[model samples]
Structure formats: structure tokens, C-alpha cells
Target: MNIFEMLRIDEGLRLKIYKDTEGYYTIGIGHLLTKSPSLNAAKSELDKAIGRNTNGVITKDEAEKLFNQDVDAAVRGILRNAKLKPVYDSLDAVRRAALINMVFQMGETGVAGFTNSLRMLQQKRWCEAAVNLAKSRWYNQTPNRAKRVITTFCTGTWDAYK
Candidate 1:
């Protein structure tokens, strides 16, 4: 078998749509849905695989490729409409990457509510920015992740692995 096929064994290929650990609609090697037809196509392929009465799979390569496209979109979605260039531009590369990475997880809409944190960033209030970030629901959703992300605000460190 190819490496991707081997990897799918490790990831546990699922033929039907299901909610992932974080509740995103998922199918076929953990491909998460977000209202796109391409993602829907992946789901349909899994459906066909099941209708044929066999193991349904999206190869690791397919999953990773689609995931990278999603990543591209997330980065674009954050940078394009964020309207915080003045604040974002003020940060170093690590800080900037951290913010983009944060937007990646929650999407720009989710991150948009962090007005206080954005304001603190605009004002160069690093500690206050950290505090504001801590006040976000994201902190409650994922404390260690929030802690790691706030380092960009608090200390200009890039700690988010993704």
C-alpha cells in the first residue's frame, strides 16, 4: 500500500459523516466540512465507497491537500477582512503568525469578538492584550492553547504549533 493508505489506517477512515472531537462535521480521514462543495465531494466519495460496500477512504494526501487549502483560506480570511493592519503590522513575525494561527482555529468571525484584545494591540498594551485574550471564550475552550497564543501578545513568542 501507498504511504497515504497506510496513514489512513492510523487515522481511522470513516465512511459516514460524523462530528469530530471539536464538533466539526467530519468524514473520510477526518476531513472537516465548512460548506464548500469540494469538501462535500469528499463526503460524497465516502458515501459511494460505502454504497459499494467497502472501506471508504480519503487518502492522507487528499486530506492533507484539502486541509492546506483550508489553511490558505483561513489565512486569507483573517488578513483580508481583519481591518487591524495598523495593529497587526506593528507586531513581529512571531506575533503576526500567532494571530493568524489564532484566526485559523476560530475563523475571523470567532476572533472578531476580541475587540478589547485588538484595541490593546493597537495601543501596544502587551500585557493588557494578554489579559483581553485570556478573557475570550477561546481561553475557556482551550486553556493551554489560549495560554500559548497569548505569548504573542504578552511576550512576542510563537508557541502555537499549528
Candidate 2:
């Protein structure tokens, strides 16, 4: 599946604002409202994007649009790194999606901190890359998702855990 499809499953759709695991105000497939410049601005932006008076809820079409926007930002942020661009280009689609998924959740800066793992990924040392990911606090915080992602890295396939 494509990164967008995978993210749809992994992040899950939410039409209304809700508290995420970390208690951040989130909506529309993990869009963190708190991360925006200001909550007021974000709320206005959300309402404007949907083009209707949404008190605290949105339509499926609106959610999909927000998801698309978030995914685009995630991908662009990841590719903005000069060193990661070539390594990302070298990988197959599934592996590329795995990285995008990672950046989607962790943010590009957080994913970029996985220097050793990125090195292993660049070298195509699948097992080592997977192992490196498993050693992180992220794996401890979200074991199931992390395992699925690491397994994908290890096996180079989405079916590795699914």
C-alpha cells in the first residue's frame, strides 16, 4: 500500500478534536493542534479549510484533506535534510514509506536523530537498522507500531507483521 493508506490505518481518522496519548489536542488523523502557531489560529484554519461552521468536528473529506497536508509536510520535512535525500531515494517504495511513516509520527527532527539507524538503513543492513530502531525510547512508548515499522525495515515488506 502507499504511505497515505498505511498512515490512514496507523493514525486512524477522527472527525472531532480529542486528546491523544500524550494529552495533546489532536484531530484529523493525528494533526496536533497544539503544535500550530496558536490554538486560536489553528482552530480558525481548521474551520476555514473545511469551509463550514464546524464547532469541533469536521467531515471525512475535510479530514482527508488535512491528512494529505500533514503527510506532505512530513515528507517534505524529511527530504529537506541534505544527507537523507540520497539515502531516501536509494530505497524501494515500501522502505521509503516506512521512513515517511516514521517521520510522520516522530517529526523529521526526531527521526533524523536516529543517526545509527539511518546509517544502517543507508547501507541496506536491514537487521541492524531494525535493531537500532528497537533500542529507542519510541519503541518502548509505542511497541506495537514500532515493531511493525521495524519489522518492515527488517523484511522490506509491509506484510512482515500484518
Candidate 3:
């Protein structure tokens, strides 16, 4: 997406700390996260990336410098390379956001791997899309979150948990 503000707004997307399925200390828009705190060179970098506290709390401003660039690049790459490219531009911002959200929750490939699911979505088969969304093993790893995402993708609303 060319609109940076749109990502921040859309990505406000959700999540800050802890794991989602694959495991990581996550944060930022669409769950900007990390699987390798061990990858850090120093405690200071760790402190910057996550926070020095219990919540792993880092402000969006903190993430902007320490993390957003990484997630932003990933988001850009996923958007560029995903098969969703076929229907991406045609999707509404809500749908696009849903896709991005999944990219963060899952991964670029994880999101791309949803071939049948995307087909259903492209067909405008909302009910099937929602059902198909939960048909995967992903639904089990994260049923509550998966349901929320499927509902958003199918209905263009994030009111489920709100």
C-alpha cells in the first residue's frame, strides 16, 4: 500500500506483545513481532525493540524507529508478491487491511498459501470464505483471533471483539 498513514491507521491495526501461532514477541500494526530476541546484539537494542518492562510495551513511536521499518518492508514485499495481487487492487480498503492483517498474523507465504480461501473471497462467496478461513489448522492454533479475522474478511468489520 502506498499510503503509510493508511497502514498505521489500519494496522492500529492490532496487537503489541506475546505470540500468535508461530511464536514471537509481537507488536505494531498487524502484530509487528519478533521470533529472535537472541538475534539482538545488546540489551539496549532489546530494550528499544521491546520495552524493558513486563508488557514488552513500546509506543507506536518507538516501533516506528525500532520495528515499523522491518514490518513495513515485509508488508510491502508481501503485497507485491502475494497471489492476492490478482484481486488486491479490486478489494476494498477493508479487505486489503484484512489481507495485511493476516500477513502479519501469519506470514507472507502463509497468507499466500490460502489459495482456496482467496478463490472463495474473489468469488464474493462471503459465507464460504468465512467457513474456509476456519477450515485450516490455523483456525485451531488461534481460534479466537482466526474467527475475528475471518469475520473481518467476510463482513468488512472488526466489531467482533470490540
Candidate 4:
């Protein structure tokens, strides 16, 4: 299948796919597969659950919108619980997206709670940043999802995840 086909856009699968074989859902841009219901159904469900308008297919525009919404919510949720902003004031948009992606997958408390990763990110150490991501309890918890987002941050390339 072509890339778009694998993404299952025409099939009405949501941007994220779930592989029952792997028992997880992949929402980031990547080649990983996870268990999801049909693409359209999943998209519709997630859209409603998150209160956003998400169709089965995620175009570039849709991706930008989803990323912003998801990341903002993820960050806000973390800040709400911790009552503090992440020390990511110096990060660029890509790095911020990477961190936000991680936070989304691991939840505010789970991923943002890491002191070491936060330090690494502050230092602009990309490799270490990626490694710190691996150190999270989320590393293997959801293999497909974790790997995809980690790859995005580490490589600064969304294609790895796509």
C-alpha cells in the first residue's frame, strides 16, 4: 500500500491507527502500527472524546490543528496539576512539539514529572533529550506510540513517526 493508504485515510480510519496485534494506538506521525477500530470510527470517537473536529483523514492543516490542540491541552493539564510551567522557555517549536508529544502520551504527571529529561531539554542536548525520553515509564508501556514521538523529538523529523 502507498503511504496514504497505509495511513488508511480513504478507509475512514482516524489519523491514528490501532493495531490489535500490538494492543496500542499510534497517534503521532510515524510508521508504527497499533490496534484501533476502523479509521473513521476511531477518528470520530476521538474527535468527540476530545471535543475537537477530527475527521478520519488528517491533512497538513488538520495535523497542525490537532497538534496545537493536543499539545496545549497536554501542557495545560500538566501545569494545572503541577502548578508550574515546564522549563522549556528556550525550546524551539520542534522541541516543544516533541516534549508536548511525550507529555500527551505519558500524561502531564507521568512524563512532565521527570527531572532529568527536563534538565536535558533545557541544555539543548538532543541525544540526551531522546534518551531521557526513553527513561520514562512510558518507554515500553506503549511501544508503537512511544517510539514514534521519541523519534520525532530525537530526529526533528516527523517522517520517522509518520
Candidate 5:
């Protein structure tokens, strides 16, 4: 599967708005509508999608559009980060997607905080990089996703999806 397709499954889809674990307004494949850029861009579409008579839920088509926009934004945000670009560019396609996926879920700032892990990745130290990733609070918070990402990093393959 493509990065976006993988992310769709990993993040899961939601038609209705709800608060995330952190209590932020979220919808449509984990899109944080309460946040900037996302909020500004989707506010109008969300209103129209739900409408006054609708069931306060968006259609699959609407969800797909939002997911694409969010994924594109996530990719741009990752590439824009000075600290991450070089490290990001040094990886193969699969590993690149792994990094992008991490950034997608946590934002560029959050992934950039993994200084040592990025360093390990840059050096092609797969085991070390995986270990460093598993040590983070992110790993504890979402162990299932983290394991898949870490395995992707270590194997340089999409075996994580299996």
C-alpha cells in the first residue's frame, strides 16, 4: 500500500467529529480540526459537509479529501523542517515513508525531538534507531503503531504492514 493508504488504515477513519485522547476536536482519519492550518482550511468544508439537515457526519468522499489534504500538509511540514530534511532524504523509499508516517501522527516538531534516533538513522544503524524509537513515550502511548514503524526502520521494508 501507499503511504497515504497505510496511514488511512493506521489512523482509522471517523465520519463524525469527536475529541481525541488529548481532548482536541478531531475528525476524518485523525484530522485535528482544532489545530491551525487544518482548522482554517477545513472549517468551511466541514460545515458544508455536515450541513443543517445532515446527521452531523461527513461522507466517505469528504473524508478522503480531508485525508489527502492532511497527508500532503504533513509531508510538506516534514520537508520544511531543517533538522529533518537531510535525515529524511538519506533514507530509502520505505524508510522515508516510515519517517513521514511518524511525522504525520506527531507533527514535525515531535519527530524532530528524536535527536539521537535521527542520528542513528542517518548513520544507517537500524537496530540502534529502532531501540531509540522504542524508548520514547510515543512508543508507550501507541505501542502497536510504534512497533510497526520501528520494524519498518529496522528492516527497510514494508514488513511492518504484515
Candidate 6:
């Protein structure tokens, strides 16, 4: 199924959609909804949360969304421009997903900061990229999360990817 179909947002949650205070779109969930003043307002917040968390992977016309226009363009460009048929021509779906997730967590600029990791990836030096991934500030702040993501991209293991 397509990504839009897969999201399957529930209306009963009174989800709010709005840009976060930090300017990212977000969708409210759980405690956020419960603490909100009104269902409509809560739903608005939830929309923003969803947008932020998904990096605009999901969107709605009425919702205040946060999206990196340039990054979105770049991603589409990469997909369209690259030859995707050969298995080794590009990253596998799992690795691509992990990279996208990481990009979402760390903005394009932040992700770009991984000069060494990017270089290593270009060289197919998976081990070096894995080490560089663990050495970033993102890893310092979220060690386990970074390690898991890095390991997955490096080793193609389910646990590491998940």
C-alpha cells in the first residue's frame, strides 16, 4: 500500500495538526491530546506533531505543516535521477528508510554534517560509516538509537534497523 494509505490516522483521538513551537509540524498523541483545551485544538496540535515526526511525509491541506521544501525536492530528485533496478545500484529499502528517519530526526543540515560518514558510504566503507555515525553529536545525545540505525545500515540486520 502507499504511504498515505498506511498512515490510517484515527479521528477519535481528536488529533490536532499544527507546526510545533520550534516551527516543525507535529501531531498530538496521548498526553498531548488529553491535556489540550478542546478537541479541535488538540487535533490541530496532533497534525503538527505528525507532520514534524514524519518530516512532512504526511500532510493535509488545512493543517499547519512543517516541511523542508529543499530536502523534499532533493529526495525526489535522487529517487528519480538514480538507476534503481540493480540491487547494488542504490541502498535497499531498509537502509533508505533508516537514512530518511535519521534525516528527519536531524535536519538536512545536521545530516550533512556527517562528512566522514557520507564519504565512507560513498566508498562503501560500511564499517567506517558505522563508526562515524556513532561519533556524532546525535549519537552522543541518543546513543542507543544512533547505534541501532548505524548498525542496520552497516550490517543489514533486522534488530539494528528496527
Q: For candidate 3, lDDT tens digit of each residue in 4-67?
A: 4434544453334544346554555544345665323233344655546424445656666644
The Cα local distance difference test for each model comes to 0.60, 0.81, 0.63, 0.54, 0.82, 0.49
What is the per-residue lDDT of model 1 for residues 1-162, given as tens digits with 9 covering 90 to 100?
A: 222332233235554566655665666554555344454544555545334322335455555665455556755776676465555677776677666656656768777777878888867899888887898667887787567668745776533333
Ranking by TM-score: 2, 5, 1, 3, 4, 6
Candidate closest to the true structure, highest TM-score = 2
Which pairs clash in the backbone of model 3? 27-32
TM-score of each: 0.67, 0.88, 0.66, 0.51, 0.86, 0.51
lDDT score of model 4?
A: 0.54
C-alpha-based local distance difference test score of model 2: 0.81
As a TM-score, model 3 comes out at 0.66
Q: Tell me which residue pairs clash in candidate 2.
A: none
**Number of clashing pairs, model 2?**
0
Worst 10-residue lDDT window, candidate 3? 37-46
Question: Worst 10-residue stretch by lDDT in candidate 2?
Answer: 33-42
Sorted by lDDT (best first), the order is: 5, 2, 3, 1, 4, 6
Which portions of model 1 show Cα errors greater than 4 Å? 1-18, 27-31, 34-42, 45-56, 159-162
Q: Please give the range of 10 consecutive residues that has the lowest summed lDDT in model 6.
A: 3-12
lDDT of 5 by residue, 107-142 (tens): 899999999999999999999989989998999988
Query: Whole-model lDDT for model 6 versus the true structure?
Result: 0.49
User: Can you write out model 2's per-residue Cα lDDT over 1-162, one digit (the tens) per residue?
Assistant: 788888887888888876676666678898776654455655676677677767778888889988899899977877897766767888888998889888888877788888899899999999888888899999998888888888887788989545
In candidate 3, residue 156 scores what lDDT? Answer: 71
